[PDB]
Design an enzyme around this catalytic site. Structure first.
Site, PDB file in Angstrom:
ATOM      1  N   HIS A  36       0.804  -1.237   0.000  1.00  0.00           N
ATOM      2  CA  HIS A  36       0.000   0.000   0.000  1.00  0.00           C
ATOM      3  C   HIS A  36       0.841   1.293   0.000  1.00  0.00           C
ATOM      4  CE1 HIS A  36       0.031  -0.393   4.561  1.00  0.00           C
ATOM      5  NE2 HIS A  36       0.503   0.825   4.349  1.00  0.00           N
ATOM      6  N   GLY A  47       2.533   5.875  10.050  1.00  0.00           N
ATOM      7  CA  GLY A  47       3.971   5.913   9.862  1.00  0.00           C
ATOM      8  C   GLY A  47       4.563   4.620  10.379  1.00  0.00           C
ATOM      9  N   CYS A  68       3.622   1.559   9.574  1.00  0.00           N
ATOM     10  CA  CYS A  68       3.517   0.400   8.688  1.00  0.00           C
ATOM     11  C   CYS A  68       4.844  -0.107   8.146  1.00  0.00           C
ATOM     12  CB  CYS A  68       2.557   0.672   7.555  1.00  0.00           C
ATOM     13  SG  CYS A  68       0.920   0.319   8.140  1.00  0.00           S
TER      14      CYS A  68
END
Lengths: 5, 299, 303, 5
Positions: free
Chosen positions: C41, C146, C148
């Protein structure tokens, strides 16, 4: 009881 | 809840752990620049554990008495005693010494602990310094010299070196000025601890955590002032509440005043009456206002 | 008590974290040898979040689209010379092998099993914690935006078994991410749509672990001569929000040390599930399933 | 409802 580790 | 027991990454401190031997005793030491710190009880032999006389012990020692190992090899070229710790100097400066300070932690404050055995880091956990100056940790035989610390920007603040178990699951250690948390002696006599207490400021933080998660059933318009709560705290095993900017932050973001949560504390302490909060049936005091600010908000 | 939430030392894993950027999206990656893993993503534009076409997004990309930076520890200049998709993860190839690549494997972790998480923001390790993988294939974590690409792992001696890469928040404080085979835990998908979760369930083997710890601490009022067979318990479990009990060597160690048989504790769970009736165990009024047999073995005893 | 992190 107090046990030095 | 979004609230987890979070400790600092431990890499920085791992590279400072070493093993220290003297006589029969082996344990962990902290290698910062040219010094290796470790518990002074590394000196005494088995059958003096109950009453050592550490000063006479120190005299009988030479630089050759101590062996320091990184599990390079380290030559000790000086030894000194500072309160309940040994300050050993070695001929090699730790190439990965982090920026650091020595600071003693206050009751209610949280810090990260690197449990170590034989100079091998084996795991981290966070703990809060209890109002009775003990810690609820996980320490076994071989554990001493394990290190506790906070972190600020790049600076590691060393605050704890593990020393002893006072009773089942209850521990203590020294600050790096050599003093023991609080006043306990490093000898194996029975020692009475003060009564532990709920950390008011932390319980308040936890309740703000609940509010931020939409769990706010315990919030009422009713308030108890800081001054009346503190008088109540004395009689009910809670620490004196002292506000900080991080709490103030929580009050502003939620719109719930500190003294509404002071009141709610008074009520919840008598019973949760069937209900849960995040989702326990009793008050949580092992999360600080800065934990809550960090893990849930900004900040 | 003697029991705390204990994570692995994170130093080894700290040395593999990198920041991965793509367009304006930035998140964390994991640098092993010549490959950088991260959530796919990172490709997804904000206006595609509720329904991203990852095939089309990947097509849109060249090697140039991705950039990798090492912010902590040994600095490094990296260049992606390859990009590919593995399920819900990106698998980038870079021109420099990671000098600090540890011995490791890719393992998918099972419900009840504990792992350590290294929470990172912009390639910089910020905290660690342990979670147990829930029976509904989520975790009760602590993550912000932030975060991920933050990774979870277990260790086998010095071998690091990577098992989790953080992806998303499903509800308040409930999270999921990918195993490194690219499969999302719980089969949740990486789009911003409401996605319902299965009912959670007590981890039977961990509850038993916890009762053993109680006994070990001098708390065994719940212990009766009576017992339930594993099979009996297992069929009962399916109907009362308890996972099936699978015995292990370390559980057997507890049974030996305490002299208390497994089936006895399963019988105990029957009784306790309804409430402790005013009593406590170490020292809560609820069953506890966030500690494993290995935690108890480790922290209370030698192993 | 799910939030990509």
């Amino acid at each position: 009881x107090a046990v030095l580790x | 809840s979004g609230l987890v027991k979070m400790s600092h990454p431990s890499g920085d401190v791992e590279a400072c752990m070493v093993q220290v031997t003297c006589g029969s005793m082996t344990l962990n030491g902290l290698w910062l620049d040219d010094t290796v710190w470790c518990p002074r009880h590394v000196m005494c032999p088995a059958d003096q554990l109950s009453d050592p006389n550490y000063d006479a012990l120190l005299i009988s020692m030479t630089n050759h008495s101590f062996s320091v190992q990184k599990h390079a090899n380290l030559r000790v070229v000086g030894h000194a005693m500072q309160g309940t710790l040994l300050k050993l100097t070695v001929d090699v400066a730790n190439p990965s010494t982090p920026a650091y300070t020595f600071t003693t932690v206050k009751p209610g404050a949280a810090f990260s602990v690197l449990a170590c055995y034989n100079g091998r880091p084996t795991g981290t956990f966070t703990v809060v310094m209890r109002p009775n100056y003990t810690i609820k940790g996980s320490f076994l035989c071989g554990s001493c010299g394990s290190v506790g610390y906070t972190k600020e920007g790049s600076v590691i603040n060393f605050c704890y070196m593990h020393q002893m178990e006072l009773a089942n699951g209850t521990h203590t250690g020294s600050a790096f000025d050599g003093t023991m948390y609080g006043a306990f002696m490093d000898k194996q006599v029975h020692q009475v601890q003060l009564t532990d207490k709920y950390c008011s400021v932390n319980v308040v933080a936890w309740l703000y955590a609940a509010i931020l998660n939409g769990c706010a059933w315990f919030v009422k318009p009713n308030r108890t002032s800081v001054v009346s709560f503190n008088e109540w705290a004395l009689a009910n095993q809670f620490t004196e509440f002292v506000g900080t900017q991080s709490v103030d932050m929580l009050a502003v973001k939620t719109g719930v005043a500190i003294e509404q949560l002071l009141y709610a504390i008074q009520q919840l302490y008598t019973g949760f009456q069937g209900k849960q909060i995040l989702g326990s049936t009793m008050l949580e005091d092992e999360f600080t206002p800065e934990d809550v600010n960090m893990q849930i908000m900004g900040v």
